[PDB]
Subunit: 118 residues, 4 copies
């Protein structure tokens, strides 16, 4: 199920005028986790042709996140398609993983032209 559990440091600039991390930054935390994940395996990462592109981001905001609380981004496989993968997520507080800031998923497809993974 689990793909990765990536610790991400929150930045002061991540917050907006309302005093909490901006909604848009959540999509960025999920992005960092995905690429830091594909970076693990082995060696240097950069590639072309049959590649992944995000088709949709579905993010639920459960409770406000404030600096300086760093997070833990948990990624797992929610759905496995022939050409797509729906990566579910849980953004938790590093100091108390029982604190859930957000869940939802991101749908990834390998296309950038026409579908392809089968």
């Amino acid at each position: 199920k689990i793909l990765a559990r990536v610790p991400i440091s929150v930045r002061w600039r991540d917050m907006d005028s309302m005093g909490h991390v901006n909604n848009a930054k959540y999509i960025s935390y999920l992005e960092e986790a995905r690429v830091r994940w594909m970076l693990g395996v082995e060696g240097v990462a950069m590639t072309d042709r049959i590649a992944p592109v995000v088709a949709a981001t579905n993010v639920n905001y459960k409770r406000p996140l404030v600096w300086p609380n760093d997070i833990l981004v948990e990624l797992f496989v929610e759905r496995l398609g022939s050409s797509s993968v729906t990566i579910g997520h849980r953004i938790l507080d590093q100091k108390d993983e029982g604190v859930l800031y957000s869940d939802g998923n991101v749908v990834v497809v390998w296309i950038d032209t026409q579908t392809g993974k089968s």
Copy 2:
């Protein structure tokens, strides 16, 4: 149905290393449209107590957006709840509104403590 059709200028910095506007920036375009919308009506805008908070952002990425193509963010009421409002959207190209960069919705609730709108 329609709540607003807000023109938004894209910035060069909006793009990422892959050469297209970053997914996270889409949530920001939707945000700007919502507040520029609440700004129209009349007078200066800033308020407290029974207030709106985004519960979820569901954004579908249809085709890549590249600078310097400015957009038009169309917002409409997809669902009207007792305490929430699901604002549907269509991010179109200003020069050709037949070009759809993204659709989906954002769920807004008036709480920030406990639900309230009824």
Copy 3:
């Protein structure tokens, strides 16, 4: 003297938790003005080889900027070197150009390898 006077829309997300546009966003406003400027002249813009790179950004913050006040970015030639150009700037309020949010300059050089413009 004057190179360009570019109107730039401020975004709500531009502000930080302190309630004013973040310092880092100023460098971005200057960036947008520079590229929107090189975009004017004629036709589509994208190029390689002898190209410009920013060597330094020297930005003075005069007074706080708050949404929804859009700005006017005035760019001019402060210094002309053999291989560099120091572009001075004045970020003013669109509704009252007597309101100065920031001045200073950005030093641009055509290198990205070794200096070259002579």
Copy 4:
């Protein structure tokens, strides 16, 4: 001399379409270092009245920074004024501190009304 040496993780989104971390993000790295610094000492941080505001950011870009190379932000006192402090900086590569991405300084003043620190 030294005020702090703060490790900062670079994010993929930090890069722009040109394939290197955007100039504006450097000001943000310097910002994070300053607040993470004021956070060390002791206890929870948030304060009002005689407070610090950035009067100027003078950043020199020495060599391009690319993800996933995390950095080390070194802050030191370049100048001590009666009401201001000019914090010099050196943004280095975490894996090789001999790699200098940027230097320069940030001028901080305690005002937000009228000068005061004497």
